[PDB]
Amino acid sequence: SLIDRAEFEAENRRVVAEGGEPAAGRPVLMGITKASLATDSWLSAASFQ
Amino acid sequence: QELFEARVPRGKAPIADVTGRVRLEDGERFYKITIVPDDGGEEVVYDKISKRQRLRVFKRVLSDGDHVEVGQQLMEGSADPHEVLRVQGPRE
Amino acid sequence: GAMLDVNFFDELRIGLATAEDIRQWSYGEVKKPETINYRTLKPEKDGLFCEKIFGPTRDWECYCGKYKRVRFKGIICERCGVEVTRAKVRRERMGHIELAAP
Amino acid sequence: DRVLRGSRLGAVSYETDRNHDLAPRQIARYRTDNGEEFEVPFADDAEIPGTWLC
Amino acid sequence: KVVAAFQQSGNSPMGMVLDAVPVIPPELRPMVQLDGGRFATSDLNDLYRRVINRNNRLKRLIDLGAPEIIVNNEKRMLQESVDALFDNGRRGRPVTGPGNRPLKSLSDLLKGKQGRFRQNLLGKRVDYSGRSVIVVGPQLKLHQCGL
Amino acid sequence: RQAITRAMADQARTIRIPVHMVEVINKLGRIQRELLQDLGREPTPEELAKEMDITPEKVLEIQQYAREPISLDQTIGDEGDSQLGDFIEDSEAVVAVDAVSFTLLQDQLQSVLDTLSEREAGVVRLRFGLTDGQPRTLDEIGQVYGVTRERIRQIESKTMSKLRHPSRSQVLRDYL
Amino acid sequence: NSVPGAPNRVSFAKLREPLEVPGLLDVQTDSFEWLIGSPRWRESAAERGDVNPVGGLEEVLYELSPIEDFSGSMSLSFSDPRFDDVKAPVDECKDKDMTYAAPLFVTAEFINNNTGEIKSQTVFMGDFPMMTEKGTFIINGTERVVVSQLVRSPGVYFDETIDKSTDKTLHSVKVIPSRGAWLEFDVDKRDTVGVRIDRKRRQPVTVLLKALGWTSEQIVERFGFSEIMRSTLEKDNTVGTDEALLDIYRKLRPGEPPTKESAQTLLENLFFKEKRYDLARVGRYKVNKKLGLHVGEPITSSTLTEEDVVATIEYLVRLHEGQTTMTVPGGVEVPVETDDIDHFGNRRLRTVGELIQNQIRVGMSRMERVVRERMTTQDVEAITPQTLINIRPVVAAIKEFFGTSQLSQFMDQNNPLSGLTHKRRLSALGPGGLSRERAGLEVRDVHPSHYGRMCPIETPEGPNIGLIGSLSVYARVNPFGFIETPYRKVVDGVVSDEIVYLTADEEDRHVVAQANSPIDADGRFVEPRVLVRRKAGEVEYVPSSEVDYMDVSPRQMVSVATAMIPFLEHDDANRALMGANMQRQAVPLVRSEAPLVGTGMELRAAIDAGDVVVAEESGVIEEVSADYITVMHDNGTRRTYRMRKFARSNHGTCANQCPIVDAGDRVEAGQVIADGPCTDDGEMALGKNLLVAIMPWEGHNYEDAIILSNRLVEEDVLTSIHIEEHEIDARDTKLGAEEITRDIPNISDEVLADLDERGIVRIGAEVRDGDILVGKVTPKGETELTPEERLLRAIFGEKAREVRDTSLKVPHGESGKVIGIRVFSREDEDELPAGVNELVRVYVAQKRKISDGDKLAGRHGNKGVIGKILPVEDMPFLADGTPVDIILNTHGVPRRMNIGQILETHLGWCAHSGWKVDAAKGVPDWAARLPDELLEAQPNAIVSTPVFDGAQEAELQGLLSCTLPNRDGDVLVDADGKAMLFDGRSGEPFPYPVTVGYMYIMKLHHLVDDKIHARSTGPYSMITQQPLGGKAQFGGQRFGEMECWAMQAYGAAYTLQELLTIKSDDTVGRVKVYEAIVKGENIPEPGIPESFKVLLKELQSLCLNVEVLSS
Ligand SMILES: [Zn+2]
């Protein structure tokens, strides 16, 4: 799955407490269709395509 | 458009993975290129490179035994951005 | 949230709907495949355009005509069954169909 | 030929949308067989029916 | 993916099958008359009539007592009617009208260039407007224009 | 065959037409069609009325009943990029100039009715329902003022004579 | 010449054409009389292939006859199509809105087999529409043209695609029939051969060969050498013919219990039982020529055959083998080659006879299913073809072809050139043809087989470039629907005159020379190294001995409209394309003066356009008027040619015809007798001759803008009469009946002055925007009043007036006189539709002056709006006080590559002033190869350059050198072609000489008054509540998505909120905005739009719980 970087870092900042484990992340370079469709607001992604 | 779509390009020219001299070979009707590592390790083998392409010229043409970079473009054409992300990170 | 939709918004939460949501949205149960009487051009009862289910076609008038002013509003005529109100509730009121098989 | 224009089968009146007094009205409670309650506002001087399609 | 999606939320997955189908309000599917009695239905009315007919026929068949072939044929027809209502042209042959024109279901009110999104939500006809042909105005100031 | 023709009469048309009217529509169609095969010309309402032993106005009403509606979701242009539903004037929508003309009518009318005295304007407003939309008549007005209905009619006639004077009327003459 | 009353227009043509221009409407007329079987067609077909004279109806009725039931005990046949006369003439049908038709009579014949009878009748088949003299149909009184359609002829097509995964040539075939089932024989990535039959999951050959009944030994015998065929024979993995037949059936009846008699017959069904499979006459000829099966044998048996299928397989595998030619047993050998599907030997032309024949075939099928249905249910010894044949699905198919089909197009007649050019139109889109989204880029190009068959220039510059074309000048249609082209055959280097029509295949066989070649007055060439065209579009220098065909003239490649552009060979193809597409858009002026510089194609393409009255047979004039001409024939008879004065065209333009003959003149047959709309003494006149100058003046001619004199407005030089048709009907209703009357409601007896005593206005009363045309009032019923309205009726005593007025008001922004009032009635027993009591049409006309913003253009694509109509004094005048009339810009000339306008300008000045080459001591060196009577010319003498053989540049310098003076001794324009203009405004002379001359420019139909539009508050849409659309209503302009992006990018948030809420959809907000504007208050705060709420209820209708949450 593909998640945003800030949410990823904030989740690791939350989960280093309460017992420490990192989720392992690698950067991806995704195209602009998939970037627009995997947005947070369903309304824009519905209105696009 | 294929740059912004992050497609794999038509004239795909694969890039290097580690420095060293090159293992150049002209196979049956197309090429066969392999990187000789310097630590070393496992040799990265690039088999299915068409002879319809061209080798990369710079400064002279790519000759055998020449010392390549970490992400030196081997053939001539268009590099896919996925591979240069995976090799040379976000900045490059 | 706001049902007449004054401009105060914080979210817009979609969700998969259930049958207890659907028959709570509705104001009636359409159960006849009729729209309009061919001769008088008025909507049928329990049809796809029934003023009992969906609201009046005329501003502050019931179907039998026994109430025709604003002073009778919010109430329901005890014979025709059509709630006397403004005639833009036919823009918004929904109905439902109880299926016989899932 | 003509025109185009069309009308919904119904009149659109415009009067005062007053709210201070109305015709006063009752509230009756009908019940289905399966425990469902429904409230229907009838007018005061109105013969309330015994059964009602809810 | 979808299993944890149904787990995390408060969504029961019971709503994927459907028991009561709702009806869009009458002015959104209006039957307007033109000047001269040629009416104008809105092409959803026929799909709702198909669903209402097939549902009432199923109800009378179950009340009357019918063999299993007829009842399962009727339930398959009910299924295809609801499928045509939510998305005509999705599964199998699109339900045609007169002139062999495929009909416009609820999914075809949103998809493509002619849905509500690209046609009426984002780009609207506006009042207080006008157009004309243009000509060159070489005596005007830069902030002026002809009219 | 009976069940199929019965349900075909029920569920073929959008607006429902009952079976007897469906049968006389089909008889009129078959008669007009066979006369189109035999004469070669489409016949007349009086010819069809004489042929079906009915009246020409009944023939006209059947001809009005026969027509099926055309859909709002066909392609209006010679290519398909617009529907018919995007080209129909909503002739019951708020015209947005009669509304402001009506509000200005109400303001000017309250001014002109305030140019009189108070019993007079009260009688006019109750007689024509300008305060609640309920048109009070002569006995209710004489009851709420505590006089006889003939006095109310005298005041009504006197004020309506006052209003027909053009000084109280030039500002209202343009509102028709 | 060869046209008797022609104007004397001297040509610069160095050559001579052998062949005349043909009968420019033959592509319509000969096709339609091919469909009927007119005797002129009958004898012409007897001239050119006599053995099978069959009309299209005879073909359909033969392929229908006989019709037998499943019993086989009775049969029904058809024969002898035959028309009556037409039931009403042309003008009466066009007036009374009748379709100009004529009845079909068909001798039917019912035969019972068991007892033995014939039942012969003469069945009325239907009223069939009839082509007029001008090549148009008249449907419902309107006039309609059926456009010819390009499509790809059925046959066998061969191509290969390379495979970049493998780098192997992959040959294939597509045996495309008409209304059948396809089958394709490919060669895949391996060395096998899938035989995909009817779109479903491939195949090897051997299953199909055994499925026809070939043993494995017969496969090896027919395919010995073929390594792929023997490889698939070894990989056949199924032995037994029926064992292949069952596979077969399973793959083609997936969901059916197989049996041996079904798969034996269903394979014979799809390809051999011809009721479900018919490659046509064209398909049979194409396959039999490509494979060379039959040579002299006639065309019959329109299904396939096993010989053709195995020859297809052998040809495909030898094509993969890389063979050159292939002999089939039983036929002469053919070359082995792949096939372009764009070459005109493969892209046929379904003309109008083919189209109407296809519609009649699909009508007769629907008739036939009904007939063989009631061939059983009817009782025997009782019935007859009167009781069998149903003509209602037949007549319905014709009426739904001519009405509502995208080839039954509306006749685009705003001038005779577009009237001609909407005919002769090739359109590759339509039913059975490719649509524009399915259109690739490769079909839109110009394949080198288009030369002489379709013009490369003329095509619409929108999104239809290449999909719509037009036929060549000399082109002529092959009876199989191909496009033949004349050629002058040359034998042994002697150019003969035997003109031989070749289609695109024999254009590839042979070799083709040029008409601008040095013929040495004997048929002999001069130089041996001659330009020529080879098969693949190549251009070579053959020695002058192998040339076996030469072109008939130059300008052969080009269309009709494009051949009316002088100096066309100088212009670039883009601007020539624009000029050809804008020459069809000129409007008929009130004067219509002929052009000075022209081509040959102004006279011929006007008398062939139809809109000019032509003297039918010779004689003398008796009586002229403005309305009729009575000729006196030489033998007793007289005949009145009625005019057409002030008739409305199909695009609102005038259609006057005034005579050009006097009362004592003698006319000959085939002479122009009366000019049409855009004609002048016989020939075309699309505009006027205006004095032009090419300086950039004061920024008003900036970036294609054009300025004009005021003389054009004063003297009515550019002025078109427009005629508009308004229409209302008085129909029935539920409440009662409507009535055309003068008792309208609340309306001052001021506006009821123009109206007559019974409704409609008086003829000649000038109207303005919003006036009353037809007093027409409807009932309303009973609606309770508002109390304020009630007391207004109480004060003023005016009644309720229960009727409601919907009068015919003339719409906004229109005016002008009222020419004519055509009224119908039920009381006259006129044909009116059901529920209509009284119809009336009112024709309104105005006389538009030329005005700033209107669109003008020359004949070279140099369009441009009118920037500013200056007065006549502030215009650059010559040394002789003559002002120029328009002023074009310089900067549009060199970068658009269209110096044809400059050559036209200089030659136009030469023809205006008149030259005289003083040949005192011999002829000068430029003027040697000029024709005679060009050595001198008169002022305002008409000249003409043909297209690809015209004025040379040395000849233009030679004419421009001696250009005899006006009235004084004054050569105003020197040898360079320029002149010393004075500034009309300031007064000083310009410091540099400026080009002047006479250029021929047109007035396009993009007038400002048809385009300007405004809306404050108007009609509203129905379901959504947006404002409506288009100039027919008010409507607003679509503030679309990209403009929303633009105003986001500025950051203007409030204006975006405005334009998307309280100008379009905030339903309660709009009236508050209007009220607050009138009262002068502030604009209120906007609410929720309406289309969002519509979206909300649609999403709640799709069982999606959508809810707005507060916090
Ligand atoms: Zn009621």
DSSP code of G826?
T
Burial G459-477 (b: 16+ CB within 10 A, else e): beeeebebbbbbbbbbbbb
Question: Which pair of tokens denotes residue G775?
Answer: 């007093």
Q: Do E120 and G1026 touch (CB under 8 A)?
A: yes
Phi-psi region of G1011 (alpha: psi -120 to 50; beta: other; left: phi over 0): alpha
C99 C-alpha vs ligand 1 centroid, how far in Å? 29
Give the integer Cα–Cα distance in Å for G408 and G425. Answer: 12
Give the integer Cα–Cα distance in Å for E90 and E93. Answer: 8
Torsion angle of C-alpha atoms G437, G441, G445, G448, degrees rounded to 10: -120
Q: Within an 8 Å CB–CB cutoff, is residue D48 touching chain C?
A: yes
Q: Do G1033 and F87 touch (CB under 8 A)?
A: yes
Give the integer Cα–Cα distance in Å for G725 and G819. Answer: 10
Chain C nearest CA to F37, separation (Å): 30
Give, in order, the Cα–Cα distances in Å from G509 to each of G535, G545, G549, G551: 7, 16, 11, 15
Tokens 């019965």 sit on residue: F6
Can you name the residues that pair with G920 across neighbouring β-strands?
A: none
DSSP code of G1060?
I
Chain E nearest CA to C40, separation (Å): 12
Give, in order, the Cα–Cα distances in Å from D26 to each of C75, C91, D41, D51: 9, 27, 6, 17
Give backbone dihedrals phi and psi of G503, rounded to 5 degrees, phi first. Answer: -85, -175
Q: Do chains A and D touch (3 or more CB pairs under 8 A)?
A: no
C-beta separation of C28 from C53 below 8 A? yes
SS3 G313: helix
The 10 Å Cβ neighbour count of residue G910 is: 28
C-beta separation of C84 from C61 below 8 A? yes
Q: Within an 8 Å CB–CB cutoff, is residue D28 touching chain C?
A: no
| Amino acid in the structure at residue G326 | M
Neighbours of chain B (3+ CB pairs under 8 A): A
Give the integer Cα–Cα distance in Å for G195 and F3. Answer: 50
Q: Considering only residues 120 to 139 of chain E, which have any Cβ-Cβ distance to chain A shorter than 8 Å?
A: 121-122
Which residues make Cβ contacts (< 8 Å) with residue G780, sequence separation at least 6?
G735, G802, G803, G804
- Chain D residue closest to F132 (CA)? D16
C-beta separation of E46 from E103 below 8 A? yes
Give the integer Cα–Cα distance in Å for C88 and C86. Answer: 6
Q: Do D43 and C42 touch (CB under 8 A)?
A: no
C-beta separation of G15 from G495 below 8 A? no
G248 C-alpha vs ligand 1 centroid, how far in Å? 68
Give the integer Cα–Cα distance in Å for G238 and G242. Answer: 10
Interface of A with E (CB under 8 A): 1, 46-47
Q: Do G1108 and C1 touch (CB under 8 A)?
A: yes
Picking from F88, F97, F169, the nearest residue to G1074 by CB comes out as F97
Burial G16-39 (b: 16+ CB within 10 A, else e): ebeeebeebbbbbbbbbbbbbbbe
Which residues make Cβ contacts (< 8 Å) with residue D28, sequence separation at least 6?
D39, D40, D41, D42, D48
SS3 G586: strand
Chain C nearest CA to E10, separation (Å): 10
Exposed, middle or buried by CB within 10 Å (0-12, 13-18, 19+), for G116? exposed
Chain G nearest CA to F148, separation (Å): 23
Question: Which pair of tokens denotes residue G927?
Answer: 């003027």
Can you name the residues that pair with E110 across neighbouring β-strands?
A: none
The 10 Å Cβ neighbour count of residue F2 is: 6
Which residues make Cβ contacts (< 8 Å) with residue G999, sequence separation at least 6?
G689, G690, G692, G858, G886, G888, G901, G904, G905, G908
Helices (H), G890-962: 900-913, 953-961
Burial G669-680 (b: 16+ CB within 10 A, else e): eebbbbbbbbbb
C-beta separation of G678 from G417 below 8 A? yes
Give backbone dihedrals phi and psi of G26, rounded to 5 degrees, phi first. Answer: -65, -30
Q: At what angle do helices G56-64 and G352-377 cross, to 10 degrees?
A: 30
Tokens 């005192």 sit on residue: G920
Question: Which pair of tokens denotes residue G863?
Answer: 């369009």
CB contacts of F15 in chain C (<8 Å) are 34-38
Three-state DSSP string of G1069-1086: HHHHHHHHHHHCCCCCCC
| Amino acid in the structure at residue E3 | V
Give the integer Cα–Cα distance in Å for G930 and G927. Answer: 5
Q: Within an 8 Å CB–CB cutoff, is residue A30 touching chain B?
A: yes
Tokens 């040898």 sit on residue: G975
Give backbone dihedrals phi and psi of G39, rounded to 5 degrees, phi first. Answer: -65, -25
The 10 Å Cβ neighbour count of residue F90 is: 20
- Chain C residue closest to F62 (CA)? C39
Find out whether C80 is annotated in a ligand binding site: yes
Give the integer Cα–Cα distance in Å for G1109 and G1100. Answer: 15
Give the integer Cα–Cα distance in Å for G821 and G592. Answer: 28
C-beta separation of G413 from G650 below 8 A? yes
Which residues make Cβ contacts (< 8 Å) with residue G284, sequence separation at least 6?
G299, G300, G301, G302
Q: Do F128 and G794 touch (CB under 8 A)?
A: yes
The 10 Å Cβ neighbour count of residue D5 is: 19
- Chain C residue closest to E50 (CA)? C33
Q: Do C22 and E22 touch (CB under 8 A)?
A: yes
Which residues make Cβ contacts (< 8 Å) with residue F103, sequence separation at least 6?
G1075
Q: Select from G792, G572, G667 the least CA-distant residue to G3.
A: G667
SS3 E41: strand
Give the integer Cα–Cα distance in Å for G180 and G198. Answer: 10
Q: Do G1105 and C15 touch (CB under 8 A)?
A: yes
Can you name the residues that pair with G836 across neighbouring β-strands?
A: G731
Instruction: Indicate if the alpha-carbon torsion angle E32, E38, E44, E49 is positive or negative.
Output: positive
The 10 Å Cβ neighbour count of residue G221 is: 10
Q: Within an 8 Å CB–CB cutoff, is residue B42 touching chain A?
A: no
Burial A9-31 (b: 16+ CB within 10 A, else e): eeeeeeeeeeeeeeeeeeeeeee
Give, in order, the Cα–Cα distances in Å from G1085 to each of A39, F141, G1048: 31, 43, 20
Header resolution in angstroms: 3.6
Q: At what angle do helices G227-234 and G306-321 cross, to 10 degrees?
A: 110
CB contacts of E86 in chain G (<8 Å) are 1102
Torsion angle of C-alpha atoms G245, G249, G250, G254, degrees rounded to 10: 180
Parallel, antiparallel or unpaired: strands G476-477 and G468-470: unpaired
Give, in order, the Cα–Cα distances in Å from G577 to each of G571, G682, G1006, G1027, G1094: 10, 26, 18, 38, 47
Picking from F6, F71, F83, F87 by the largest number of E CB atoms within 10 A of its own CB, the best residue to mutate is: F71
C-beta separation of G857 from G1001 below 8 A? yes
Give the integer Cα–Cα distance in Å for E11 and E57. Answer: 33
Give the integer Cα–Cα distance in Å for G586 and G414. Answer: 7
Question: Which pair of tokens denotes residue G613?
Answer: 């009255």
Question: Which pair of tokens denotes residue G795?
Answer: 């004060």
Give the integer Cα–Cα distance in Å for C98 and F23. Answer: 33
Question: Which pair of tokens denotes residue G123?
Answer: 């069945």
Q: Do chains E and B touch (3 or more CB pairs under 8 A)?
A: no
Q: Which helix (H) or strand (E) holds D5?
A: strand D5-7
Neighbours of chain G (3+ CB pairs under 8 A): C, D, E, F
C-beta separation of G350 from G147 below 8 A? no
Give the integer Cα–Cα distance in Å for G1055 and G495. Answer: 76
Picking from G865, G1035, G1101, the nearest residue to E22 by CB comes out as G1101
Can you name the residues that pair with G740 across neighbouring β-strands?
A: G776
Tokens 């992604």 sit on residue: A45
Q: Do D8 and F99 touch (CB under 8 A)?
A: no
Question: Which pair of tokens denotes residue G1064?
Answer: 């379009």
Picking from F89, F105, F128, the nearest residue to G1020 by CB comes out as F89
DSSP code of G374?
H
| Amino acid in the structure at residue E8 | Q
Q: Select from G484, G574, G644 the least CA-distant residue to G861.
A: G574
CB contacts of G1006 in chain E (<8 Å) are 133
Give the integer Cα–Cα distance in Å for A45 and A47. Answer: 5
Q: Obtained via which technique?
A: cryo-EM
A37 C-alpha vs ligand 1 centroid, how far in Å? 51
Q: Do E20 and C33 touch (CB under 8 A)?
A: no
Q: Do C75 and D17 touch (CB under 8 A)?
A: no
CB pairs under 8 A between E and G: 138
Give the integer Cα–Cα distance in Å for G337 and F125. Answer: 98
Can you name the residues that pair with B50 across neighbouring β-strands?
A: B30
Chain A nearest CA to B6, separation (Å): 5
Q: Within an 8 Å CB–CB cutoff, is residue C87 touching chain D?
A: yes
| Amino acid in the structure at residue G377 | T
Q: Do E21 and C49 touch (CB under 8 A)?
A: no
DSSP per residue, G504-556: HHHHHHS-B--SSS-B-SSSBBS-SEEEEE-TTS-EEEEETTS--EE-SSSS-
Can you name the residues that pair with G349 across neighbouring β-strands?
A: G150
Chain G nearest CA to F29, separation (Å): 13
The 10 Å Cβ neighbour count of residue F1 is: 5
Phi-psi region of G340 (alpha: psi -120 to 50; beta: other; left: phi over 0): beta
Chain G nearest CA to D50, separation (Å): 34
| Amino acid in the structure at residue B32 | K
DSSP per residue, G508-520: HHS-B--SSS-B-
Which residues make Cβ contacts (< 8 Å) with residue G672, sequence separation at least 6?
G3, G5, G6, G607, G612, G613, G614, G615, G660, G679, G681, G682
Residue G1004 CA neighbour count, 13 Å, CB half: 23
Strand order in G494-499's β-sheet? G494-499, G488-491, G549-550
Q: Which helix (H) or strand (E) holds A33?
A: helix A32-37
Chain D nearest CA to E54, separation (Å): 23
Question: Which pair of tokens denotes residue G643?
Answer: 């005019």
Which residues make Cβ contacts (< 8 Å) with residue G808, sequence separation at least 6?
G726, G728, G772, G773, G774, G776, G842
Give, in order, the Cα–Cα distances in Å from A6 to each of A9, A41, G727: 5, 17, 68
Q: Within an 8 Å CB–CB cutoff, is residue C27 touching chain D?
A: no
Question: Which pair of tokens denotes residue G655?
Answer: 């259609």
